Every structure is written in structure tokens, then in C-alpha cells.
Write a protein that binds this DNA or RNA. Structure first.
Lengths: 378, 378, 378, 378, 378
RNA sequence: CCCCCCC
RNA sequence: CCCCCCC
RNA sequence: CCCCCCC
RNA sequence: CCCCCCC
RNA sequence: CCCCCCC
């Protein structure tokens, strides 16, 4: 009768997108440099060498960080990643070489890695300014500690920690989260800031921004690396920091869904409004779709996965405005530059939410007591 | 046995129509160029010179955009798409040559793309006008940033984004959606309109009208390119914009089905009328057919698919009238030049719907709160 | 006992007709010209010169439209269709030559098509008339647009759209649908009558009437061409008009089945009559036979298929009369020249249907309205 | 126990008749002309000559019609049909020759058909009569249309339409259906009798009576021609008329079976009498036998099929009397001369049937009037 | 487990009578005349000469009719039939010779038959009496039509139609059915008695009793002849009369089984008695044996087949008693002289049967009927 | 015979 | 014929 | 279009 | 004996 | 012992 009149739209859009039998493959360019497990030691060394040298031009650092992440991923692993992401890449293998260069009269040996995008001379320079920083440190503080040196196995993870902050703030995608990444990199990694003096949140964040914006496939590489890291059994304290930071990106850009479930929990009065009970059916449909997506349903906005718009509650202006007003009333909404599309419900829900947090009676159903001892205390 | 006197008309039309044992093949003309994955880079560059050029003559941009879509699909992929759409073409290979022409006394060498429907001289004119605009740009502000030049990896998707707007607004089919395309293309892509001084929504939209009118195979190529494009697990911000614009087209020409679902949701009164319960059987059949189609049933009016008419609610004058009246009452029509077929139901349902949008009681049964203090609240 | 006195008569007749082991073959005449896919371009071009020509002699247009239909089907496809329909035709291949006629002193070269039922001088005269009309248009409006010319890929399908109208109205079998064809071809195809100045629906409809009456195999070629066309995935909007106009034919000459379903829907009282419950059993037999036939059961009257008379409800005077009376009551039948065979039931059912139409109380059982609160709001 | 005390008798007589190992073949006569598919055009033309001729000598038209039937079947198919029917006839091949006959002083060249049963001089007489009639029409009304003339592809099918009427009314087999053939051929074929001025239904009907009484094998040739004709997918309107008129014969001589099904459906009371329940088992075995036969169980009485009498309900005098009394009660038997064998049951069934026709209360349960509001209003 | 105890007795008597190893054979006597196909014409003319004659001496008409029967079957076929019936006869062939006997001074040419039991002079007397009768008839009315004379190809079949009546009524075997033969031969064959004034069914039927008792093998010749005739698909009206009149003889002598089925149909009560439920097993074995025989289960009593007596229900006095009592209750037992064996069951079943024929049963459940006022108001 | 309207 | 809106 | 906060 | 009407 | 009527 009137129960079969339903056009299941988001499920059908999902079925359309998943079941397209023609596959596109996007041209990256010439090739991507793909180290294996053996180059991981050298890449960690390079990251530490970046972090020990004072105020280096860290403009390349995002590239080295992506190299480290994909090197721990592995040759066949990153090739599988770029096959799954739909890209034509030829595996430009990475090997360890040694180049002797005569600088300032003295010719000495420095190890060199085979990179298409990164040249030998840049490595040799960053090496010489690293030596400069090392000698100045030996002059000032006498001796360098094993923790104060670039030999720690957590330098790459520190760089990718700042990258994880960047990728969390890349949900907006308009270079607005740079200040918040600065705040987070100042707050988190305090001890790394005090031990490694070469940590510059501004330069590292800007380099990661640029390498992510110019090279979209690197974002996918890093996202699956981050899911891989956040599944290992154990790790160092810095790897724990990175896992905790990257798990913040889960649910990036989907905050309307979380505020909706919160408005369900805090029981905003006007989720029973008529115009909201109108769209509650499609809201339930969206939430069930999010659950069915499950594990990755939080990384569809970090990646610009085109099934992300399937998880948007902005297409329901009544529900969107009531939930946004509810979140605003409880004060959770900060400078969230998201306008409501229904002013009346937004203002009314904001008023009730402002009212609610001030009041609040002791819920005796929650309390386990049978005899009111507080009344006895009274 | 009056329960068995039933005729299933849409299902039988579908079974007639998809189970034909004789097939036609409509010859296009001479041939269609089907570039392989190699020329994708040069096509991106061509779009880059298209957008960099000040006030460019974009009247040859629709062909280049469709060429980019064929490239990203791939040679065997686009040939498969045409052969499946019932079309004689021959696989016209695409390769890059160099043409040396002495122009204005000086001899310059250019990298030319060899195409049947696109000639060398107009490509050279594009390139030289790009050079002139590049010289002007460098003169006015000194240095061109990498973002400010033709080397961007997303000019093709920018042109295809204006194309997606055109494809969405071709449901009118009579060049009446140009104004809406202009508005949307100015609202969307503020950054790109601000950066590339040659982005004209009017010129590109008119070009895309022309290319989609003259060559009806291009529209199926583009729609299947859009469905395949919106499936890839990754993307940039501009491919994300393209997927977002495209998924607007899903359900083009079929707003009446979704407005019928809306009438079900808001529990409109005149869906219980007797002359509407007369049609509810076939309306349920149409909606069941739409669900059974599932995926592509949103792209049957963009593609001028002959199976589209089976998803029309104009054959139900009473149900169409009440649903359009409901849409009018809630004010969510706008214009929708389509007229109702039963003026009495339209006016009465519209009056009730306008009664809905101003009333609205906060249904407290929706909130599953056990607290009885709500009575004190109210 | 009296459960097995059931003479399955419609099913038995269908079994007798389908399971006959002797086949007839009917001779058509001299031959039928069956162009292959190659000549489609020039046949479309001929239709274009037909439509551009001012007030052209359209008495030779039906043959050209049918030739375009076989060209779109192809050589072996139309030969297979004629073989399956039981006709003796030999494949008169069609190819492109040049025949030069000296007219007005000058000797000109005209591209000519070699056919048996089409001469050469007819194509020459069509060409010269089109040239005169083209010159006249150039003189009047200065310049001719490509949409004002014969080269467009829509002229053939415009002619075939008028053919589809005529094929729908050919059910009456009396040349009575010429008025309806004119009205429909003026409502539909407004743009093309505004652009092409030679579209005369009267002359084209008359020529199509003539070509279908004097060559009966062209009707089967055309019906299976339409079924083949409306299966294609995509097309232009003129092929969209053709598909939409053609699928109006499905259910030509079987309106009584549809009105029987409708009279079941509106719950007309006299479907419970004793004299109608007598016939309900074999009526249900007809309906389940129609469903068993399924797809093509709508094109048995357009084709004069002998199995058409098995889908007639006029062999049930009580049920046919009550259904026609119900249809009259609701105003559906406008000028349906079909007398009811039981005047009492016809008039009584019409009276009850008229009681239905103006009355009708809004059922609140269909709507899941928990509280009928609007009653107090009234 | 006694669920297996049943002596199935109709099936036993069936196998007795069919499975007698003596198939004795009779001597027929000289031969039958069995033209192949190439004589079709000339026989069609000859039928046209007969039809356009003023008050034509139609006493040789029946042979022309049946010869057209064989020509449409084909030489080998008609030979196979005569072999299956069990006749000694040899394939007298038919070809076209030219006989130049000097008539009225002038010698003219004519197309003559070599037939043993149709000599040259009478064909020439018919042709000269056609010439006279054509000159008379041209002199009277100026110019005859090509539809008015002999070459139209359905003159033979007009002749065979009148043959089909005669075969329907040849159940009695004593030329007592000539009045019905005249009335039907006046009602049907109004346009054709308006145009072809030689159509005298009395004359053609009498000739077909004569040819089917002189040549019995023509009855089987024609019946299988009709069954083969009614199998074609499509055809002209005249072939549709012929097939629809042939379908009237299916069930010739077996009106009692269909009247019995009707008497079951109309729920006549006396089907529950004792003297009817005595024979309801044999009646249900006859109906089961008819259903088992299926397709050809309708064309047994037209043919002289030996198993004809097994499908008669007149051997059951009580059920026969009830069925025939019901049929006479409802008035559906106009002048059926068959008398009941049991008068009392006949009169009682007739009286109850007449009581049915005037009374009759609307069933409100079979009609799906679940809604008590609609139930109470009516 | 006690379904194991079934001693099947009728089937065992079957295989005992069939698989006997001592088969003692019988010599008929001298021989019998067995004409071939050629003597058919003269025997047919001779039967015509018998019929045309007024009050003709029919003492030899039975032998002449049987000679016509053998002549139509043939020579090898009648020999085969006599052999399979187990007879020792030699084929005394009969040929057409000419005998000139001078009568009353005039010598007349007559072509005559050499027959063992039919002399030359007797058939000469028949010829001359036919001539005298023709003389008288021509003098009295003047002119006689071709259907009124001896050359009719159906005079022999009129004789054999009376023979078919004889064969049906030959079950009693003691010339008791002569009045039924006369009545059936006056109802049937009224036209012939109007035409051929020699038809005395009393005389012909006495002749046929004489020829069937005097030559007991003529009964098998004739029965197989009739089964052969009723299988030829073509024949005139007299041959149709013979077929329909012969298949009356099927089931001769076995009315008891048919009336048992009939009593099962009325649902007579005394088939649930104890002393009938005892013998239901033997009754069902008899009925299954009858079904297993099938075809020839009907002509075992006309022929003197030794396996005849195994199909008698008189051996079950209680089931035979109830069946005969019932079929006397429903009236359909005429002068059947067979008294029942168990008078109590006979009378009780007859009383119940006569009680039934006053009241009507209800059979509504097969179709939808509310049946509250529909019942008892009928 | 069937068909018939509107779209 | 179908389509038509905003996004 | 979607996205925008805090950790 | 079978067939028989109207379409 | 089997058969037995009507069509």
C-alpha cells in the first residue's frame, strides 16, 4: 500500500558505484620511487638527519616522510596500494649507492639513495648542514647524547606524527587547519620538541600540505599505512603517539553524524518535531549505511572517496539544523563554520540545549540505591 | 477469482524491451578518436592551456573534454562502451607528432596531437594564445606559481565539472538550463574561477551543449565515465568536486518519484483519497520496478534511455496531482514548469501541505525518555 | 465432480496455433530493397532533403522511412525478420553510385542510390527541390545554420516518429486516425516543425498509411525495428521521442484489458454481480494467458497477429459491458465507438462510477496517523 | 476402497479406434493440382479477376480459392497433408504457360495456368470478363484506383474468408447454413463488398459448398491451411480477418461442451440432481479427454475424424438435458434445433435459468469491499 | 504389513487361460467365400438391387452383406482375421463372371458371381426382381433420381448399418432384441426407408441373426470389420451412421460394470455396508483387470472370448445386488431381466436411489459462493 | 470476426 | 510522448 | 556538491 | 447414432 | 455358470 512507496536512494547509489564494470586508471606521471624494507634504515637516518639540523629548509620533508611510510609499507605493498587506487605506476626500485663529492677542497664519502624526485646534491647538502649542526652542538653542550642524536628509530614516526596532524586537518581541504596543526604540534611532541631542536611545525606542516596537494595518491598511500600501523600489536611510545594521533582522523568531516547521535543521547526535545520526523526515515537510512560501511566509514573524507557524500546529513536541512543547534547549545560547536539551513529549528534547539545543561536533576533510576540516604543526609 | 484479474504493464514492457532478439546499430559518421592512456598527460596540458588563456575562445573545449574522458576510460574501454551502446565506429588511434610552422617570420616547433575531429592548426592557435596570455600574466605579476600555470593535474576535471553541470541540466533538453549551470558554476569552484582567468561557465557550457547535441554517443561515453570515475577509492579535490557534481544527476528527470516518497514521509492527507488509492497499485509497481533496477535507474533520463518512460508518474494523474500539490505546499518546487493534471487534488493537497509547514507539534513519543519531568517542562 | 468440467479454451487455441507443423509462405512481389549499415548515412540524408524542401511531394516518403528502418536494422537482420515472418523476398542489395542528369543545359553530378522500388530520377528531383529550398532559405535569412539543413542526424527519426504515431493509430483499420495523428504530430515535434519547413504531418501520415496498406510486410519490419530501437542503452532526444511515441502502441486494440484492471481497482460494485461472476472464471483465464504471453502481447493488434482475438473481452458481454460502463463513468472513454452488449449493466455501472468520481472520503486507514488531531483543528 | 472402482471408457474407445493396426487407404480419383509457392501470384491475380468482374461466373471460384490455399501451403506440404489424411493423390505439378487465343477476330496473348481441373478456355473467359468489367468501370467512373483492381495482394484472402464462413457453418453439413453465411458475409467485409463489385456471398458460398462436397480432401487441406495461416506472426488486415473468422470454427459441432462449462459457471442448481450426479463421472471423463486432446479437439467435427463421437454429451441424456435447458433458459441458443432427451429436467433447468437472468444480488464479499465505510454506504 | 496378503485371483485366472499349453483347434467345415477388392463393386450393386425391390426376399441378404464386408476388408486381411481368430478355412476366391440365361424367350446378359453358398440362379432372380421393381416404380412416378437407384455406393452400408444394430443387440443371443433392432432402425435410417422401399429391418435383422448363428465366424469377421470401418477418416453419411451405430456395440454384455461406476457416482449408501466392504477388494481387482485390458475389454462378450467371464460382477452377489438395485432405483434399468442375488441389499439400495431422485445435492465449493441465502432459497 | 478513446 | 525545481 | 570545531 | 445457435 | 435395458 503506502509502505512499499520507498526509493532507497543512498543504498542504490552505493550499488551503482560499487558495481560499475568499467574501471578507469589515472596517470600519475613518469614513476614513483618505491623503496623496499632494506632502505628503511637509511630513510630513518635521513629523517633523523632532517630533525637534527637547525632551521633547515624543510620544504622537501613531506616527500621524505612519504618515502618512509611507503618503505615500511613495502615494494609489493605500495604497488598493490597504487593498483587498488587506480593508477599507472612503474615500480622505480630504490637502492643504496655511495657518491664521493669534493666540497670546499675536501672530498669525502657520503651515501646516496636513488630517487627520481630527490637528487644526490640535496642529500649531500642536508648532510653538510647536519654536520654543521652536529659540530655546533658538540661545541655548545660538549657531548651529544644517544637520545639527542639522529640515530633514534623514532624520527620517521615523529615526522609522520606531524603528518598525521596535517592529514587530520586536511578534511576541510582549503589550507585553513595550519594554525590548528601548529597548536597540536606544540602541545603534542613536547619532549621531541625539546630534544630534537630541528622540529619546525610550520615547515613540516607546509611541506606535507604541498606534497599532499600536488600528489593525491600519496594521501591514499599514507591512509592505508596509518590503518596498517594502527593494527599492529605493539610499538614504541612514539609509534603509540602516532597511532593515537591518526585515529583522530577517523570520522574527519563526518562530525554531523556524531553530533546527531549525541543529540539522540542528550535527548533534545525537538527531535520529535514534525519536520524532523519527516526526514527521520532517510536519517536512519544514512546511519544504517554508515554502520554497514563499518571500518573505513571514517576515512571517506580524508581521501576524497566519492562515496563520501553518501554520508552527509546536510541534505536534510531540518534534521541538520536541529542537530547543529543542539550541538551549539551544549557548547560543543566551536567556530564551526557550518550554517543551519532551517533557522527556526536551529534557534529553538539551541535555546533548549542552553537550558538543559544548567538544569538536571539526580536521576534516581541511574542511582542504584533503594533507600534515599541523601534524604537521610538532608 | 477477482484477485487474479491483473495486468502487469511496466514489467511486461521491460520484458519485451530488454529481451529483443534483433539489434540495430546506428552509424555515427566517419570515426571517433579513442585515445589511450598515453595521451592523457598531453590532454591535461591542453586543458591547462585552455584555462590559462585569457578570455579564451572555448568553443572547441567540449571536444577536448570528451577526449579527456575517453582517455581516462582507455582505448579498449571506450571501444567497449560504444560497442555496447550500439554504434559503428573504428578504433582511431591517437598519437603525438611535432609540427614546425614558421609564423610571423620566426619558426617555432610545437607538440601536436593527431586527431580526426580536431585539427592541428586550431591546436597551434590554442598554444600560441596560451603563450600570449602567459607572457601577459608574467608581465602583470612577475612570477607564475605552479598553481597559476597549465601544468596542473586537474584542468581536465575542471572542464568535466562544468560538463557535469551541463549533464545535470540537460534534463530540460532545450538549452533552458544554461542560467542554472552558470549560477552553479559560479557558486561551485570559486577558487578555480578566481585562479584561471579563462574559466568562462557560459562558453564552456555552450560548447558542451553543442558537443552533446551533435554527437549523441558522447553523452553515453560521458555518463559511463562518470559512473566509473565516482567509484575509485581515491581522488584529488577536483575529482572530488566532479564526483559531487555528477551525483547530482542521479535522479535527473525523476524528481517526481522522490517527491512521492516525500509525500509518504510527511504523511500527506490526500494520499488516502479514494481516487488516489485507485492508482496506489500501479504506483507501488513503479516504485518496485525502480528498486529492482536499482543502480542505473537514475541515469535513464540523462541518457535518453528508452526504458526511461517506465519510471514516469505522469501516467497517474491523481497521484501525480496530489504529489505535485504536496511539493507546492511545502514550497520545495521553485518553478518546476510541469503542471498538475487534477486541479482539485492539487489545490486541496497544496492547502493541507501549507497547513503542515506552519503547524507542527513536538511529538514527545519520538523521544524515548522515561523521565516524567517532561510534563513539568510542558 | 464439477471442478474438472473446465474446458481450457484459450490455452488450447494457443497450443493449436503455436504447435502446427505446417508453415505457409507468402510472396511479396518483385523484391524488397534491404540496405546494409553502410547506406544509413545517405538514407538519413535523403530524409533530410525531404524535410528541408518547401511543401515537398511527400507521397514518396513512406517508402523512404521504411528503407531507413531496414538500413538501421541491417541486411541480415531484416532478411532474418522476413524469413521468420514467412515471406519470400530476395535480398536486393543497395549501394551508392553516381548518376548524372543534364537539366537546364548544365550537366550535374548527383549522388544516387540504386534501388528497385526507387528510381534514379526520383532521387534527382528530390535533390533539385532541396537545392531550390536551400537557395530560397539562403536568400531570405542570409545564412543557413547546420540545424537548418538536411545533414542533421534527426531527420530520419522525425519521419519515423510520424510513422510511430500512424502505427499507434492504425489499430482502427479504417484510416480514421489521421486527425489524431495530425494533432499528436503538432503537439509533439513542435521544435522540428518550427525548424524544418517541410514537415507536413498530413502528407507524411497519408504516405505512411499507403505504404503500410499496400505492403503488409513493412508493418512487421517496422514493429520489430521499433522494439529493437527502444532497447538501445542511449541515443539522441529525437530517438527518445521515437521510443516514447512507439511505446504508446504497446496496448493498441487492447484497451478493454486495461479498463478491466481499472474497474477492479476502483472496486466497481457490479463486478460482484451474478451475471459477471459467471464470466469471471474465463476472464481470469484470459488475463493469465495475457500474462503468460508477457512481452509481445501488446503488439498483436498492430501486427495483425492471428493470436490477437484470444485477448478480446468482447466474448464476455457481461464483463465487457460492466467494464465499459465503469470506464464511461470515470470519463476515461472519450469517443470510444464501442457499444456495450448489456445495456442494463453498462448504465448501472456507469451510474455507480459517477457516484465514485465526485464523492470520495479521505481514508485515514491508509495513512498511519496515530492521532487524528486535525479534526479538532478543523 | 472404491476410489479405484472406475472403468475409464472414453479412453478405452479412444485407443480402440486409434490403435487398430488396420489403416485402410481409399482410392480418391485422378489427382489434385498442388502448385508450389511460385503460382501464388497468378492465383491471387485470378481471384482478383473473379472479384472485379461484374456479376462474375463464380461457379468455378471455389476451386480457385482452394488452389490458392494449396499454393500458400506449398507442393511438398500439401502432399504431406494429403498423405497424413490418407489419400491416393499424385502431385500434379502446376506451371505457367502462354496460350494465344483468337477471339472476336483478334488474337491476344494471355497468361494461362496449366491445370487439369481448370482448363485454358474458361480461364480466358474469366480474363475477358475482367477486361469488360474494367473497361466498364473506367468508362463509368473515370479512373479506378489500384485498390479497386485485381492486383491487390488480398483478393484470394477475401475468397478464402467466405470459405471460412462456409466451413464454420458446415457443421450441419447440408447447406443449411447459407442464410448465416450470407448474413455474416454482409456484416463482415462491408468495405470489400463496397469496392470489389463481383463479391456475391451467395455465389461464392454455394461454390465452396459444392467444392467441399465434391472433393472431401479439400476440407482437410483447408482446415490445415487455416491452422497454418493462424500461426504467422503478422500480416495484412484481410489475413487477420480470415484468421479471426477461422477461429470461429474451432468448436464446431461441440457447442454442448462449452454450454456445459457455462452451466457449471452460472451455478445452475440441477447440476446437483440425482440423475445428473449419476453420470457426472462419465461427463468429467469426457471433459478430461477433451483437455488431454487439447489443440485439435475442436476440429474433429469439421473433419470426419473417426473419434468425433467420443466428445458428445448427447449420450448422457440427463446432463445433456440440463445443459441444453440452461442454454435455452439464458437465451444463448437462438434457434439451436437440438432437442433435449429428458424433458422434465430440461424444463426445470430452463425455468431456474430464467429465474437467474432477472434476479441476481450483488456479492459484496467477492468484491473486495473490506472497508466497512464503503460497505455501509452501499 | 497386511497389505502383503492379497491373492489376486482374476489376474491369475487370466494368466492361466492365456498361458495354457494345450490349445485344441477347430475345423470350420468346407470353406467360406472371401472376395477381394474387385468384387466390392458388384456386391454393392447387388445390395442396391435388394434395396430398390419392394418387399424383396431378404432370406439371403445377410450373407450378401457379410460378403460385402469381406470384399471391403480384402482377401489377405479377411484371411488374417480368420487365422488370428483360430479358424481352419481355405480362401475360396470369388470372381466376376458372366452368365447368359435365356428367360421367357429372351436371352439377357448378366454378370454373375461364383459363390459356394450363393448360387447363380438365386442372384439372377434377385437381378430380375430388381428390374421388375424398377419397372413398377418408374411407371408409378415417372422419373427416378440418381440417389434413388442401385448404383448408390452406400446400399451395402445401409445393410451393414442394420447389421451394426444386430451386433449391438446380439448380447442376449436368443433373438430377443429384434424389437429393439426394429425401433432403432426406424428412428435411425428414416430417410433410407423413405427412399429404398426394400428396407424391412424385421427381415434383414432376422437374416443377420441367421447368418451370425449359422456361421459363428462371421461375427468375428464383422466385429473386426466394424472396428476397421470406424477408423477410416473419410466417409459419406451412411458410413458415418455405420461408425456411430457400431461404437454402440462397444461394451456389450458388460452393463454391470458401467452401472457399478454409476452407483459409485451417486454415492449410494449401501456401498458402505459391511458385506459390500468385504468384497470391495475383489471388485477393484475386476475393475483394474478391465482397465488393463482396455481396448478389447468391450468386445469380449460379442465375440465368444474365453476370458470374458472374468469381467462379471455377478460373482459378487452383494456388490452386484447393490449396483443393480441402485440402477433400477434411478430408473435407468429398463426391461433388464437379470434378477438380483441378494434381495435385501437390492431393495434397500433401490429405495435409497429413488429417495435421491427427489432431492438436490449442493456442489458450490468449487467456485466462490457465500451460500447462506444462495442455499435453500434456490 | 477483432478493432475503435486520450496520451 | 517523457522531461522541467534548488542543490 | 560535500567539507569546516576540539583532543 | 452424431451434428444443428449467435458471433 | 455368464449374458439380458436405452441410445
Amino acid at each position: 500500500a503506502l509502505s512499499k512507496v520507498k526509493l532507497n536512494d543512498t543504498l542504490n547509489k552505493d550499488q551503482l558505484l560499487s558495481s560499475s564494470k568499467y574501471t578507469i586508471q589515472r596517470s600519475t606521471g613518469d614513476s614513483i620511487d618505491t623503496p623496499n624494507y632494506d632502505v628503511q634504515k637509511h630513510i630513518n637516518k635521513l629523517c633523523g638527519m632532517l630533525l637534527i639540523t637547525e632551521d633547515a629548509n624543510h620544504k622537501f620533508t613531506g616527500l621524505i616522510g612519504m618515502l618512509y611510510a611507503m618503505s615500511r609499507l613495502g615494494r609489493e605493498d605500495t604497488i598493490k596500494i597504487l593498483r587498488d587506487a587506480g593508477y599507472h605506476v612503474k615500480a622505480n626500485g630504490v637502492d643504496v649507492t655511495t657518491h664521493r663529492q669534493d666540497i670546499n677542497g675536501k672530498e669525502m664519502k657520503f651515501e646516496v639513495l636513488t630517487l627520481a624526485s630527490l637528487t644526490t646534491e640535496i642529500q649531500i647538502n642536508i648532510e653538510i648542514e647536519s654536520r654543521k649542526s652536529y659540530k655546533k652542538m658538540l661545541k655548545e653542550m660538549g657531548e651529544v647524547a644517544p637520545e639527542y642524536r639522529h640515530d633514534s628509530p623514532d624520527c620517521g614516526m615523529i615526522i609522520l606524527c606531524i603528518a598525521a596532524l596535517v592529514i587530520t586537518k586536511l578534511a576541510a581541504g582549503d589550507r585553513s587547519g595550519l594554525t590548528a596543526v601548529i597548536r597540536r604540534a606544540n602541545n603534542v611532541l613536547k619532549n621531541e620538541m625539546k630534544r630534537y631542536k630541528g622540529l619546525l611545525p610550520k615547515d613540516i606542516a607546509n611541506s606535507f600540505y604541498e606534497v599532499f596537494e600536488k600528489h593525491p595518491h600519496f594521501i591514499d598511500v599514507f591512509v592505508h599505512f596509518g590503518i596498517a600501523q594502527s593494527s599492529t600489536r605493539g610499538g614504541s611510545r612514539v609509534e603509540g603517539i602516532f597511532a593515537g594521533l591518526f585515529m583522530n582522523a577517523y570520522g574527519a568531516g563526518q562530525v554531523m553524524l556524531r553530533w546527531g547521535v549525541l543529540a539522540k543521547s542528550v535527548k533534545n526535545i525537538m527531535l520529535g518535531h514534525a519536520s524532523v520526523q519527516a526526514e527521520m526515515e532517510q536519517v536512519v537510512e544514512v546511519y544504517e549505511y554508515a554502520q554497514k560501511l563499518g571500518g573505513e566509514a571514517g576515512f571517506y573524507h580524508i581521501l576524497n572517496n566519492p562515496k563520501a557524500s553518501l554520508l552527509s546529513l546536510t541534505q536534510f536541512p531540518h534534521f541538520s539544523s536541529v542537530v547543529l543547534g543542539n550541538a551549539a547549545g551544549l557548547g560543543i560547536m566551536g567556530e564551526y563554520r557550518g550554517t543551519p539551513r532551517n533557522q527556526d529549528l536551529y534557534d529553538a534547539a539551541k535555546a533548549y540545549a542552553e537550558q538543559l545543561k544548567e538544569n538536571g536533576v539526580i536521576n534516581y533510576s541511574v542511582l542504584d540505591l533503594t533507600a534515599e540516604e541523601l534524604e537521610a543526609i538532608k
